[PDB]
From a paper:
The transient receptor potential channel TRPM7 is a master regulator of the organismal balance of divalent cations that plays an essential role in embryonic development, immune responses, cell mobility, proliferation, and differentiation. TRPM7 represents a master regulator of the cellular balance of divalent cations and mediates uptake of Zn2+, Mg2+ and Ca2+, which is required for the normal prenatal development and healthy adulthood. The TRPM7 structure represents a tetramer assembled of four identical subunits, with the overall architecture reminiscent of other TRPM channels. Each TRPM7 subunit consists of an intracellular N-terminal domain (NTD, residues 1–789), transmembrane domain (TMD, 839–1146), and cytosolic C-terminal domain (CTD, 1157–1230).
First, we determined structures of TRPM7 in the apo state by subjecting the protein purified in glyco-diosgenin (GDN) detergent or reconstituted in lipid nanodiscs to cryo-EM. The corresponding 3D reconstructions resulted in 2.61-Å and 2.19-Å resolution structures. Since all previously published TRPM7 structures represented a single closed state, the nearly perfect superposition of their resolved regions with the corresponding regions in our structures suggests that our apo-state structures also represent the same closed state, TRPM7Closed. We observed excellent protein density in the TMD surrounded by additional density, which allowed us to build models for 18 lipids per TRPM7Closed subunit. Most of these densities have a head-and-two-tails appearance and most likely represent phospholipids.
Numbering used by the authors:
A (entry chain D): 839 to 1006
B (entry chain D): 1099 to 1147, 1157 to 1230
C (entry chain A): 3 to 540, 614 to 797, 839 to 1147, 1157 to 1230
The structure:
Amino acid sequence: LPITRKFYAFYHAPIVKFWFNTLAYLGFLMLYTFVVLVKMEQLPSVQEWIVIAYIFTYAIEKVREVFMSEAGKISQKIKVWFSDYFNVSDTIAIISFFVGFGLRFGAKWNYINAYDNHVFVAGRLIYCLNIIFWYVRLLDFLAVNQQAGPYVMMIGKMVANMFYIVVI
Amino acid sequence: VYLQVKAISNIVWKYQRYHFIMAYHEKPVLPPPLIILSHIVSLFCCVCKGPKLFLTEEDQKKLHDFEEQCVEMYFDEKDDKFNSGSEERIRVTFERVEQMSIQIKEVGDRVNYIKRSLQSLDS
Amino acid sequence: QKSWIESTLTKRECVYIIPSSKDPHRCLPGCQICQQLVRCFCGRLVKQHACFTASLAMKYSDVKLGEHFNQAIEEWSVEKHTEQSPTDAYGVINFQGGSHSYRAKYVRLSYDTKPEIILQLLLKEWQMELPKLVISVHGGMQKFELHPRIKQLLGKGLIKAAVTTGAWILTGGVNTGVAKHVGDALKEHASRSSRKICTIGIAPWGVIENRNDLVGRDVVAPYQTLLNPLSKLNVLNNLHSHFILVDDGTVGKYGAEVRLRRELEKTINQQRIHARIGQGVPVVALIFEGGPNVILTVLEYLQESPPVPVVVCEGTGRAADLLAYIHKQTEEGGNLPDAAEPDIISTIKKTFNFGQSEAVHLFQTMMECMKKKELITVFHIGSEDHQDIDVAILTALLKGTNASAFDQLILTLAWDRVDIAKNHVFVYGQQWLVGSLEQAMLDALVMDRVSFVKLLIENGVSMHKFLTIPRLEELYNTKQGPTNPMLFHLIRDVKQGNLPPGYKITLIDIGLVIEYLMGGTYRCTYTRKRFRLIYNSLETKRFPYPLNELLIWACLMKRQVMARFLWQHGEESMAKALVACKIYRSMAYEAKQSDLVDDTSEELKQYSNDFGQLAVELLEQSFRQDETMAMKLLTYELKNWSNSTCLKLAVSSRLRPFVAHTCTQMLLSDMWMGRLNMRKNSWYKVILSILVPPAILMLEYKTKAEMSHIPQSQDAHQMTMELPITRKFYAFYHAPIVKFWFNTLAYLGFLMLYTFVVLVKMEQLPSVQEWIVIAYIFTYAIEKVREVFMSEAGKISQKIKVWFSDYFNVSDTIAIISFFVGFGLRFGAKWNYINAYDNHVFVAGRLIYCLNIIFWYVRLLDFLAVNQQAGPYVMMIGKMVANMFYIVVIMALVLLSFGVPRKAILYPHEEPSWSLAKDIVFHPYWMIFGEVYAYEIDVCANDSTLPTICGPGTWLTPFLQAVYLFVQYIIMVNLLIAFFNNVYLQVKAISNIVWKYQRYHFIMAYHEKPVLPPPLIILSHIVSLFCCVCKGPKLFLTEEDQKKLHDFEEQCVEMYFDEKDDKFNSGSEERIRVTFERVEQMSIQIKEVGDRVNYIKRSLQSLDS
Ligand SMILES: CCCCCCCC/C=C/CCCCCCCC(=O)O[C@@H](COC(=O)CCCCCCCCCCCCCCC)COP(=O)([O-])OCC[N+](C)(C)C
Ligand SMILES: CCCCCCCC/C=C/CCCCCCCC(=O)O[C@@H](COC(=O)CCCCCCCCCCCCCCC)COP(=O)([O-])OCC[N+](C)(C)C
Ligand SMILES: CCCCCCCC/C=C/CCCCCCCC(=O)O[C@@H](COC(=O)CCCCCCCCCCCCCCC)COP(=O)([O-])OCC[N+](C)(C)C
Ligand SMILES: CCCCCCCC/C=C/CCCCCCCC(=O)O[C@@H](COC(=O)CCCCCCCCCCCCCCC)COP(=O)([O-])OCC[N+](C)(C)C
Ligand SMILES: CCCCCCCC/C=C\CCCCCCCC(=O)O[C@@H](COC(=O)CCCCCCCCCCCCCCC)COP(=O)([O-])OCC[N+](C)(C)C
Ligand SMILES: CCCCCCCC/C=C\CCCCCCCC(=O)O[C@@H](COC(=O)CCCCCCCCCCCCCCC)COP(=O)([O-])OCC[N+](C)(C)C
Ligand SMILES: CCCCCCCC/C=C\CCCCCCCC(=O)O[C@@H](COC(=O)CCCCCCCCCCCCCCC)COP(=O)([O-])OCC[N+](C)(C)C
Ligand SMILES: CCCCCCCC/C=C\CCCCCCCC(=O)O[C@@H](COC(=O)CCCCCCCCCCCCCCC)COP(=O)([O-])OCC[N+](C)(C)C
Ligand SMILES: CCCCCCCC/C=C\CCCCCCCC(=O)O[C@@H](COC(=O)CCCCCCCCCCCCCCC)COP(=O)([O-])OCC[N+](C)(C)C
Ligand SMILES: CCCCCCCC/C=C\CCCCCCCC(=O)O[C@@H](COC(=O)CCCCCCCCCCCCCCC)COP(=O)([O-])OCC[N+](C)(C)C
Ligand SMILES: CCCCCCCC/C=C\CCCCCCCC(=O)O[C@@H](COC(=O)CCCCCCCCCCCCCCC)COP(=O)([O-])OCC[N+](C)(C)C
Ligand SMILES: CCCCCCCC/C=C\CCCCCCCC(=O)O[C@@H](COC(=O)CCCCCCCCCCCCCCC)COP(=O)([O-])OCC[N+](C)(C)C
């Protein structure tokens, strides 16, 4: 096994792509947690820019996966991908984020004290609610473990089954 | 409901592991901030131009034979599991005791008519 | 050519074109028909020759102008006038038939191929296992059918004989005779022997339906199996697996097999049946339902040098029923009865239409056959003769061939047929040489022939005399049996990491492997002085207990069925089972730590647990007979197994069912007591007596007899000879139960003081209470160092590694280290400020104390774990923490998913700070524990306690909190309840076993712990140390008690096997099947009597008139 072949073997292994995406995702959440918890100025901070870059490119990556799936028919490719819980949530997460960035970034500051401008506030509050989607997607990463993964599947099944007791 | 839900959830977890692992064979190397290079580059290189199992012909031979051998074992172990159960041995025993119970009596009649011999033969 | 066949084996195409016999058929002009009808004496019409050389002979007129001096028309020879050229067909035919293709093979070799090339063709080119037998069936062709009795049986034996012996069945192959009956017998026993019987049809390339469909270089020709009507031609019988078609001559002529097939019958015999064995491969012949050239062939095989014996199954047809009676009218090897010309040659004239023109010629062939009837076995059907011919075929090779019984035995050994040898070789009056049965034992062990080892031990081989050093050396070094590749991997890891070229293994190296596997201080007999000296010098060269040495052999060679057998022989059965468990367990470990391919770590871990269960089951058997003698079995020194005990061996293998067995637990409880009868006493009189020493003199102690089953110290067993006053104090303070409460009271008094110290204000100098606390922990710490550096295993790095495997020793280590950091800061701190807590070094010291004390309250769970009820629950708590981990990880994520939005919405004007980390986790955690923070939920309400937080978006946080608590309480808390409810019983069960198991190490520890507890323990350290400069528990048994105990062990092992045979033979499943089989047998005899009684009816007719 020559030297350069060994790098190929490493970076193209699925286990490596996972931790390589998992570390990037954790670093993504640390920054996006920093952004929502720290005061927000007119222009996005370096942390907020990196967050936007992730979600934009993460979104293109999902469009790649849909339009290259298996079955030729788009209306079948679409219909299967929106059968997974976390792809529905990711779709809501991506769409809601850019509504938020649009309001946050497109808002004109007539008032010097932020939070006088409601369009800005609606943007920031979308961020603070959009981040819930991204912490819950960590359950998808955690679902790679043989012990954890079934319990994640159980939680959704038990919510469905307990519905009528909760209605009462 | 814990045990039945846990059991169904293990099967579903194990099943959805196919689609998850297969996905990471077509995902780019680079992660989603730096993934754009793997998008731009890969796209551009395509304009400049799934996983398969590869088997030698001898390996195809030995694999097709392996499949045939194991199907044969599968039917043999069923016939020998059914023919060796107690329920099947009771009924073949039942039917064979039914048959004998005729022949036992039938011999019983013949031997009772070889008694007719004893009378005629001795005088 | 890319093929050995294409470059070696040949065709025989008739280049020379002899016109047919002489005469044209019809059709007056003789130029069209002299070409067209007139075939070759080759045997085909003229244009089929296609002679690459003489293709233009037919266009002219033909090869070889007509007249040619009639003599020279027979001058055509298969030898001369036939161009040897490539094969042109060798491949894989199939047979669309009884639910399988039933594939096969053909080479289509010429005819005059050398005899060796077949053997090379059969073994490497076709990849066939060399057989242990060759059945060469013969007979006539195109017969209808047999009696439905005989038909079913002939197969049943023919199959059985061939499958049990890896035999080849040589047939003609063509489905018009002998082959038919072979094949029809195969399908009645197919998919049971379809991979052990390699039948071979050595048929010609003449008489066959589609010769041209068989053609094709390396083809998969889909050959038919439909009887092509309107013809006489024959088909290859489908149920054969190999064919050697013989290209010669033509269609119709079928005589070119005797030259080749016979040579194969001669060349297989010159092969050696096995490596360890020197006898040649046998050849047998089963003639059923034969003809005139068979009777020639029978005598041609008997007259041969050496003779090939013959079987004759009477009633199949003419030659069988004939010979069966024609070699019945004779002396044993001599002359015929009163002149037999009339009746013998009568049937020879009736069966074969002769009329004395060929009726003497057969009778002359008969009278030569009867010169050797000892080789003509005959299967007397009707009178259950030799039971389903397999005996009759195989015993024919063991009937008279002046072969010694040593050769009759090896042949059964290679066949793996014990029933044959015991019933036909170990017959009354049989006589043996001195080491013939020894050489047969060496072979059976090297070949893993377990059932022949039994036959030879019974019949009188003695392992005490058989087994020697050089023999036992060989048994390790043989590559002539089911070896273990991993043994070398363990040898080269103990030698130096290297190996010489071949390296014939030595027994000192085996001794070194066992010590590595058995571990600890195990020292093997093979690494001892006397063995190391005598082996250098290589009764002295025997072994006193040879089946201990072969059990080790069989277990290191991964020969389990031989190990189980050898285990049942000899003495010390429970110990041997526990040694085997440890050997396999350690082998399984190093297999799990080697990059080899066949991991064999579940095969070895399963073999370990098989012997593990045997030891447990023998203990239960012994315990059911006599508890007190069974407890002695756990602790008597073995002296053939490094002076260990059965209990220590089980602990070595981490064998919990043995240690957690109630017998072992009963013994541990008795050792806990010491000399104290804690049935007549109460725990509060012990505590009272630790505080009131003179109350020691009014407890109920135990007699030396009541202590007979209990191991003791040497000093403790000498004070058993009598109970004076001072001996009674010894018995009290050295009992483990007393040392416990004596340390437990001191520990509780230690915590009361250390609780006092942390709760009461702290001055510059430590108080009297704090000094006593420091003294305890210092001396408690030395006590732990004593325990580590005096444990068991010599190697510090193993002593260290085991001690830090216990939860509470890790915590004690952290506790001791953290304490003296705290005392150092507390005591070493200089007070620059008069008000304490201005000096931070002092504070850090005191706060370490206040946190270090948590370790010491939790160590009380270790004391509490001495109770049978409490102790399992303590073990459960740790197991449930491990198992609940991922449910709690999910809860932690739900917490953050709420905490981060809450803080962000409510506190939007924050700068970076570590308080942010607190605030996202703090309130969400306390919500889990019944605190909803009711007046902070809606911060804009009138009753809000956070009115200044009221601002834009804050109306979202009640919705978030409502979702959060639904998920945590309604889902996640109750999932955890459901988790614990459903795993409780299996965790409680595992925790009871672990509690019971760790009770060994706990009770054993208190036999080596000092009497005095950890503040006053220093005296027992200083004194004991100093007294050593001035200079384990064993069971002691008298010689008579050793006798009665060794007999007890033997008795209970015998009961153990008897109760198994009688439990299996008395189950309903076993009685149904023996009933099944006996009803199957009767159902034949009932009908058989039914036929006889129906033929005693034939009497009634004839007798009465
Ligand atoms: C398969 C599933 C995954 C993929 C799904 C992907 C597509 C999903 C959908 C995505 C679109 C979501 C909506 C976008 C925003 C519109 C709403 C809005 O309020 O806009 C505002 C910003 O208007 C602007 O023009 C500034 C924003 C710049 C563009 C950023 C958003 C688009 C990027 C898309 C990136 C994703 C693309 C991914 C790759 C192609 C307008 O309001 P305003 O003018 O600020 O306020 C006026 C009042 N004032 C007086 C106070 C100023
Ligand atoms: C198998 C497991 C169990 C066994 C494990 C056993 C070994 C485990 C390890 C044990 C060692 C743990 C660390 C010791 C303390 C060092 C740290 C420290 O801060 O020290 C301080 C005290 O420095 C002194 O010199 C005064 C302390 C006297 C010695 C007491 C500790 C050693 C005893 C060991 C007894 C155990 C031995 C057991 C028997 C051999 C230094 O700080 P300061 O000078 O005070 O402050 C300076 C600032 N000022 C200006 C404010 C003044
Ligand atoms: C069964 C019983 C329930 C019946 C339901 C009927 C729903 C009817 C809907 C009514 C909404 C209108 C009521 C408020 C009037 C508007 C202005 C106002 O006062 O806003 C108030 C907040 O509230 C909001 O700003 C918006 C609240 C929207 C969510 C309401 C629940 C929607 C349904 C369920 C959603 C879940 C998902 C549903 C689907 C599954 C202002 O309050 P404040 O915080 O004190 O702010 C003032 C102080 N400040 C200026 C400093 C900020
Ligand atoms: C998927 C299931 C859906 C469940 C149903 C839908 C959800 C429930 C729907 C509720 C109706 C919506 C209420 C609108 C009220 C507006 C009034 C206002 O001024 O602002 C209020 C809204 O702002 C808040 O922050 C309070 C929102 C209510 C949270 C309810 C959580 C409990 C969930 C229950 C779930 C169980 C449901 C039971 C079954 C139906 C806050 O008032 P304030 O800050 O004090 O403002 C000052 C006013 N003052 C001056 C008078 C003090
Ligand atoms: C997409 C994938 C990303 C992957 C990560 C790698 C790339 C990104 C890495 C680093 C980018 C850092 C940019 C710094 C910009 C300089 C100025 C600055 O912010 O100074 C700050 C110093 O910095 C901090 O306080 C750190 C803030 C980021 C926290 C998360 C980093 C760790 C995770 C990622 C790394 C470990 C990975 C962990 C996972 C294993 C000081 O605070 P402030 O912000 O100036 O204050 C703003 C106040 N205001 C707004 C009110 C005015
Ligand atoms: C510069 C930075 C330097 C540091 C970088 C590195 C830092 C560390 C990085 C990452 C943290 C994890 C490290 C531990 C991994 C253990 C190994 C393992 O077995 O993993 C498993 C986990 O597989 C997963 O997919 C786990 C997903 C992790 C992310 C989820 C976090 C949840 C947080 C929510 C809670 C809130 C907590 C928030 C705390 C604030 C994979 O193995 P398996 O598939 O299960 O194997 C089973 C099959 N077998 C039996 C055949 C083997
Ligand atoms: C800020 C607040 C805190 C943050 C929230 C914490 C994070 C969120 C927590 C947990 C999320 C768990 C992730 C889902 C796991 C996978 C499930 C899945 O694959 O499908 C499941 C569907 O799923 C459902 O029916 C619902 C899934 C749970 C939704 C819970 C939402 C939270 C609020 C709810 C309460 C609101 C009411 C209270 C309001 C007063 C499958 O279920 P099934 O149909 O039986 O099985 C078929 C599966 N199959 C198709 C694959 C074969
Ligand atoms: C290592 C093994 C140890 C074993 C124990 C035996 C040896 C140890 C036994 C006794 C030592 C007592 C020393 C007394 C010193 C005189 C001064 C004094 O302290 O007066 C106190 C009176 O005394 C108390 O208040 C008792 C304090 C100790 C409580 C624990 C004793 C019971 C446990 C053990 C015995 C039962 C065993 C229980 C288990 C079955 C008054 O208070 P002060 O303390 O003066 O106030 C300090 C205030 N200042 C600091 C702010 C200035
Ligand atoms: C394995 C061994 C590891 C530990 C080794 C030993 C470590 C030794 C550690 C430290 C020695 C420190 C010596 C002094 C250093 C200079 C500072 C000084 O003297 O004074 C300063 C001390 O201020 C502090 O904050 C001191 C904190 C140090 C204690 C840390 C304990 C760590 C042990 C963790 C547990 C480990 C457990 C390990 C086992 C698991 C200030 O004091 P002052 O003059 O009063 O100032 C007044 C200021 N004022 C105006 C605000 C009022
Ligand atoms: C001067 C002083 C005078 C007084 C001195 C004397 C005072 C009293 C001294 C001590 C208190 C205990 C006395 C009761 C003993 C009962 C007898 C018994 O059976 O014990 C068992 C307990 O075995 C142990 O190992 C128990 C450990 C006790 C310490 C744990 C305390 C937990 C405190 C934490 C909670 C906080 C409470 C804190 C309270 C503030 C041993 O028996 P066994 O092994 O289970 O037998 C089973 C096998 N069999 C069936 C064959 C039999
Ligand atoms: C001041 C505070 C209060 C005081 C605390 C109260 C006292 C502390 C309480 C209980 C301690 C119980 C003692 C251990 C019992 C024995 C267990 C054992 O032997 O091994 C167990 C291992 O153990 C573990 O994996 C962890 C053990 C429990 C640690 C709990 C720490 C407390 C905090 C945690 C929560 C923090 C998170 C929350 C933070 C927000 C065995 O488990 P296993 O691997 O399945 O089995 C193999 C066993 N075998 C090897 C022998 C075969
Ligand atoms: C997805 C649906 C689309 C969204 C619309 C429909 C949603 C329902 C209803 C409508 C939305 C709420 C409208 C009413 C409030 C407006 C008035 C207002 O100013 O309120 C507040 C700000 O509020 C905001 O700035 C709005 C933020 C909206 C975030 C998105 C809601 C979540 C939808 C998820 C739905 C999922 C349901 C659950 C899942 C089944 C108060 O501001 P203020 O105090 O007046 O400002 C003065 C500040 N100053 C004093 C500093 C100057």
